[PDB]
Amino acid sequence: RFLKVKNWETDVVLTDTLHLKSTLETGCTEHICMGSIMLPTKDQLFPLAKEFLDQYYSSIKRFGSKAHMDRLEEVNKEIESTSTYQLKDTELIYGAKHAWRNASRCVGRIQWSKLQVFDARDCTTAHGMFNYICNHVKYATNKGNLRSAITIFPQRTDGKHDFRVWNSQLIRYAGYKQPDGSTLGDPANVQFTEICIQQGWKAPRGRFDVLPLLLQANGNDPELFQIPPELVLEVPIRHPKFDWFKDLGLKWYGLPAVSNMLLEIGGLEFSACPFSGWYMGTEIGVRDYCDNSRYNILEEVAKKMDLDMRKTSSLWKDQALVEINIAVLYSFQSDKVTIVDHHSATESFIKHMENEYRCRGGCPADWVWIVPPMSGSITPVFHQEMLNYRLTPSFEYQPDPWNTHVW
Amino acid sequence: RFLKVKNWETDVVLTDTLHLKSTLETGCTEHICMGSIMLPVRTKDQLFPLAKEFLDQYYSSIKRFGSKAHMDRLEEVNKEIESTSTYQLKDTELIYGAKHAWRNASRCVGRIQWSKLQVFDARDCTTAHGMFNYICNHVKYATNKGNLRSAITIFPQRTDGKHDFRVWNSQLIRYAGYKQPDGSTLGDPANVQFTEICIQQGWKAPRGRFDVLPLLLQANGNDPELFQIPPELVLEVPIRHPKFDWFKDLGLKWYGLPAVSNMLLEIGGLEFSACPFSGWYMGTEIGVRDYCDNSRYNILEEVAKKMDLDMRKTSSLWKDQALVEINIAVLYSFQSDKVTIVDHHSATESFIKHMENEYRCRGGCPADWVWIVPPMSGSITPVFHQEMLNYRLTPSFEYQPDPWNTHVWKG
Numbered sequence: 173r174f175l176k177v178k179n180w181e182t183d184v185v186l187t188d189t190l191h192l193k194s195t196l197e198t199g200c201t202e203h204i205c206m207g208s209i210m211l212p213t214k215d216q217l218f219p220l221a222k223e224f225l226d227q228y229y230s231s232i233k234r235f236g237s238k239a240h241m242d243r244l245e246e247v248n249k250e251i252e253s254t255s256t257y258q259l260k261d262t263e264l265i266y267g268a269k270h271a272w273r274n275a276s277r278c279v280g281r282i283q284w285s286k287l288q289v290f291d292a293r294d295c296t297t298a299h300g301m302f303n304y305i306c307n308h309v310k311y312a313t314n315k316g317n318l319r320s321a322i323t324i325f326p327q328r329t330d331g332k333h334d335f336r337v338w339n340s341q342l343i344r345y346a347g348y349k350q351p352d353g354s355t356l357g358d359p360a361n362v363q364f365t366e367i368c369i370q371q372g373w374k375a376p377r378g379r380f381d382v383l384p385l386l387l388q389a390n391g392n393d394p395e396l397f398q399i400p401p402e403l404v405l406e407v408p409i410r411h412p413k414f415d416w417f418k419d420l421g422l423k424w425y426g427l428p429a430v431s432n433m434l435l436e437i438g439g440l441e442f443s444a445c446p447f448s449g450w451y452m453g454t455e456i457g458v459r460d461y462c463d464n465s466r467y468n469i470l471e472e473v474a475k476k477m478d479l480d481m482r483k484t485s486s487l488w489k490d491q492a493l494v495e496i497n498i499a500v501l502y503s504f505q506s507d508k509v510t511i512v513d514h515h516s517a518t519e520s521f522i523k524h525m526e527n528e529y530r531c532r533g534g535c536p537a538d539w540v541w542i543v544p545p546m547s548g549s550i551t552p553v554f555h556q557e558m559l560n561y562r563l564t565p566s567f568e569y570q571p572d573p574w575n576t577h578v579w
Numbered sequence: 580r581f582l583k584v585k586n587w588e589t590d591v592v593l594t595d596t597l598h599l600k601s602t603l604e605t606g607c608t609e610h611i612c613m614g615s616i617m618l619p620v621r622t623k624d625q626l627f628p629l630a631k632e633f634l635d636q637y638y639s640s641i642k643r644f645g646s647k648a649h650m651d652r653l654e655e656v657n658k659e660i661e662s663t664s665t666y667q668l669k670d671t672e673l674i675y676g677a678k679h680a681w682r683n684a685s686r687c688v689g690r691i692q693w694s695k696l697q698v699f700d701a702r703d704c705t706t707a708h709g710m711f712n713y714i715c716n717h718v719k720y721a722t723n724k725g726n727l728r729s730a731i732t733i734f735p736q737r738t739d740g741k742h743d744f745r746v747w748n749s750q751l752i753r754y755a756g757y758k759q760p761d762g763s764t765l766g767d768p769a770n771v772q773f774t775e776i777c778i779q780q781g782w783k784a785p786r787g788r789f790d791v792l793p794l795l796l797q798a799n800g801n802d803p804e805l806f807q808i809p810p811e812l813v814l815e816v817p818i819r820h821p822k823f824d825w826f827k828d829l830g831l832k833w834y835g836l837p838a839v840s841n842m843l844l845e846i847g848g849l850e851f852s853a854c855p856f857s858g859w860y861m862g863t864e865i866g867v868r869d870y871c872d873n874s875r876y877n878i879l880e881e882v883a884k885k886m887d888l889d890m891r892k893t894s895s896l897w898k899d900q901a902l903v904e905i906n907i908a909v910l911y912s913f914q915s916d917k918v919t920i921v922d923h924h925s926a927t928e929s930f931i932k933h934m935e936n937e938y939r940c941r942g943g944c945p946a947d948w949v950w951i952v953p954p955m956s957g958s959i960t961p962v963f964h965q966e967m968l969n970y971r972l973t974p975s976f977e978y979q980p981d982p983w984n985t986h987v988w989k990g
């Protein structure tokens with residue numbers, strides 16, 4: 173019932189009790205581990221509300237106080253009456269920070285308590301959503317000195333009036349299917365790049381076209397907006413030693429900003445809640461640039477390096493991979509845009525693990541996601557046992573809105 | 580029921596029904612996933628059902644389920660259990676069983692090879708000298724002057740738990756580690772404690788960086804005994820780099836034969852506590868883990884120093900750069916000396932093909948993603964993008980506690 177996690181490099185053992193406050197189900201059983209699968213009423217609401225406010229009042233050292241009991245009744249009153257309730261500003265801020273703190277797949281949670289929360293619950297239209305989003309981008313970008321933030325649109329009501337950002341991230345590059353048969357730009361976004369065009373967007377049809385935002389207020393048809401280019405910080409990619417690297421014509425954006433998730437606080441659902449931090453180098457240089465079904469640039473780079481590409485065992489893919497990732501880090505650093513390498517990030521997360529065990533009784537962690545996609549075993553998280561479980565408040569996946577929207 | 584796994588690079592979707600034949604526990608529940616946890620005397624009562632499940636599987640595999648021969652063998656095993664408390668496997672059942680423990684090993688990326696396994700039956704063995712002889716023969720057969728062949732040697736099963744056959748070595752061939760008074764280590768740091776056991780048992784330690792450890796062998800629950808493998812039987816490879824001529828001067832070498840000797844083989848409820856098996860290496864086991872863990876040889880600094888990498892900031896990726904050069908060196912050296920090795924690209928590609936064939940012909944393939952994905956360059960190998968189901972089939976290999984923890988010393 174109390175579970176231990178060992179670090180095999182340091183022999184440090186931590187004891188996990190936080191898992192017993194676990195609520196939702198993992199996907200695993202006693203017979204099958206599902207650890208590597210990407211996606212495994214008034215009556216329901218008050219328990220959920222109570223559980224949250226209980227931890228809220230505990231956090232501000234006021235568990236069992238008049239104020240605690242008072243608010244528990246006010247919320248109970250409001251649910252019995254309206255079928256929902258509203259969070260106090262303070263509860264919203266605490267819930268958002270905690271959803272991040274509970275994200276078992278996020279290596280960057282050492283930062284969880286520095287999060288700027290933008291309350292957009294007063295928003296009513298897509299133009300409104302656009303204004304809120306530009307302001308988030310500008311704030312968070314901070315001319316290259318990136319700052320974490322989330323903007324929270326109005327909560328679900330009857331589920332026929334959802335606020336949704338249709339983009340998967342606030343800033344992403346377009347993908348187009350070519351007659352040719354190959355793909356121009358980012359193949360991840362082909363479908364969406366079409367939906368934008370199937371709605372009037374004028375595609376420059378380049379390798380790196382910043383997608384328009386596609387915004388849905390109150391369950392209405394969504395609308396297109398170009399983000400002002402002066403608000404999209406981008407970095408040209410060059411290598412500190414290979415003069416030819418620049419001629420690849422690669423660039424990436426400075427701000428990672430996930431916009432398709434659902435934030436759950438105290439039973440309430442915030443279906444539009446874009447949030448942003450700063451990149452770990454490998455996200456761009458390993459995944460965005462080198463995945464088979466992403467930009468897939470390994471061959472081109474290997475060639476320019478004149479490596480022996482005739483056999484897998486020359487490790488030419490591995491050599492090219494390192495150089496590409498050196499380029500990404502060097503570039504962002506040179507243009508003074510915040511970035512972290514996987515060494516410093518995983519080291520940070522280990523420190524964060526020790527803090528959460530020391531201070532909260534544990535830290536839910538998903539090893540499959542936490543371990544970087546390159547050089548796994550020379551980063552300390554490789555050797556660290558982790559326990560994965562689901563705590564609330566949380567971020568959750570949700571079906572892409574086009575599959576669902578009533579037009 | 581039916582479960583789906585998707586490959587997110589290819590969109591290929593596979594259906595698992597084999598997990599319905601799973602018995603043992605994973606360690607996970609609906610409320611916690613223990614997927615990254617490293618380690619998560621029987622009675623007649625429990626034995627005949629376990630015998631029965633196993634023989635139903637053997638007999639279906641040979642298309643004689645329900646045969647007279649199947650039924651007579653059930654009755655025969657039944658009777659042997661009630662009369663003697665245990666039973667003996669026929670040669671054919673033993674072979675089949677050891678192959679399936681390998682087939683079912685969900686942490687093993689090499690399983691495409693599962694059906695080509697040389698089985699050596701050492702169940703007539705009685706003494707530690709007998710074990711030494713059996714192991715030498717295994718090592719010579721498997722080595723095959725560099726053209727590695729997979730093999731397993733199987734010593735008598737557990738009886739009462741007081742008479743166990745054990746190989747005390749974690750692998751048949753490994754290098755000594757020696758803790759020095761100044762707190763530094765000579766040789767392999769993983770093997771310090773075991774080296775100390777060997778020394779106190781009477782081993783005269785050469786005390787260099789690559790001293791092949793003696794075998795410590797326990798027969799029939801008796802105190803274990805020391806033996807030196809004839810050095811002409813221990814194939815080793817000096818490590819050099821195709822472009823870097825200073826690489827050889829680091830003084831590195833490794834052995835060709837990876838041979839796990841500390842696991843337990845369970846077949847139809849029988850427990851074989853000494854069952855050394857061997858295959859051939861994936862280069863990253865040596866180049867990433869053996870040489871580059873901080874708790875192992877830890878050569879990253881020395882290598883990057885010679886490479887003149889910018890070592891002042893991790894963001895130069897000096898570690899990543901050196902790591903790749905060491906792994907190039909390992910594969911180059913083995914290939915140049917004609918010792919079988921596979922790179923992590925070719926081994927993970929073979930595994931996806933094996934895994935898909937297994938879904939098509941068997942209804943599933945249990946696989947542990949934490950173990951299957953290589954410890955460098957993970958996402959450029961096709962396994963990274965492969966959804967996997969982990970579960971426990973028997974026959975199987977299992978961990979067992981190190982025998983210096985449990986053994987009752989006799990003298």
Ligand code: HEM
Binds near residue numbers: 277281
């Ligand atoms: C401050 C710098 C941050 C770093 C370096 C970072 C790091 C990462 C990384 C590397 C991933 C893996 C993503 C992938 O591989 O596709 C990830 C996932 C995630 N992060 Fe962060 N993060 C940061 C800030 C944030 C913030 C501000 C939030 C929310 C407030 C957040 C919440 C999440 C969530 C929910 C996931 C998993 C999403 C999913 O399941 O697809 N992180 N994080």
Ligand code: HEM
Binds near residue numbers: 730950
């Ligand atoms: C033929 C070449 C083989 C290759 C390339 C190979 C590859 C590997 C690798 C890389 C590992 C993980 C090692 C680690 O990370 O420490 C492993 C684990 C394992 N393999 Fe193989 N393997 C081979 C043959 C075999 C054979 C012959 C058997 C037994 C019949 C076997 C059974 C196992 C088992 C039981 C594990 C898990 C060990 C543990 O949990 O500590 N493999 N395999």
Ligand SMILES: Cc1cc(N)nc(C[C@H]2CNC[C@H]2OCCC/C=C/c2cccc(F)c2)c1
Binds near residue numbers: 280
């Ligand atoms: C706030 C933040 C900071 C950071 N450094 N990285 C991130 C993650 C961002 C940046 N890189 C990928 C993106 O993660 C989004 C999740 C990607 C997973 C793929 C995926 C998820 C669901 C369905 C599907 F088909 C694919 C977020």
Ligand SMILES: Cc1cc(N)nc(C[C@H]2CNC[C@H]2OCCC/C=C/c2cccc(F)c2)c1
Binds near residue numbers: 689838856857864
């Ligand atoms: C038959 C076979 C073939 C092959 N290529 N590799 C292997 C695995 C071999 C070769 N390299 C590491 C070794 O695996 C050892 C397995 C045990 C895992 C290590 C381990 C487990 C618990 C605590 C600990 F400190 C270490 C076996």
Ligand SMILES: C[C@H](O)[C@H](O)[C@H]1CNc2nc(N)[nH]c(=O)c2N1
Binds near residue numbers: 208209210
């Ligand atoms: C199948 C597997 O679960 C999938 O490929 C995962 C593996 N680990 C990951 N880890 C991170 N950080 N991001 C990912 O997209 C993935 N993909």
Ligand SMILES: C[C@H](O)[C@H](O)[C@H]1CNc2nc(N)[nH]c(=O)c2N1
Binds near residue numbers: 554557558950
């Ligand atoms: C804690 C974690 O489970 C442990 O370090 C695992 C991770 N994956 C591994 N994978 C392989 N192949 N070998 C290992 O020793 C490990 N170690």
Ligand SMILES: [Zn+2]
Binds near residue numbers: 207
């Ligand atoms: Zn699990």
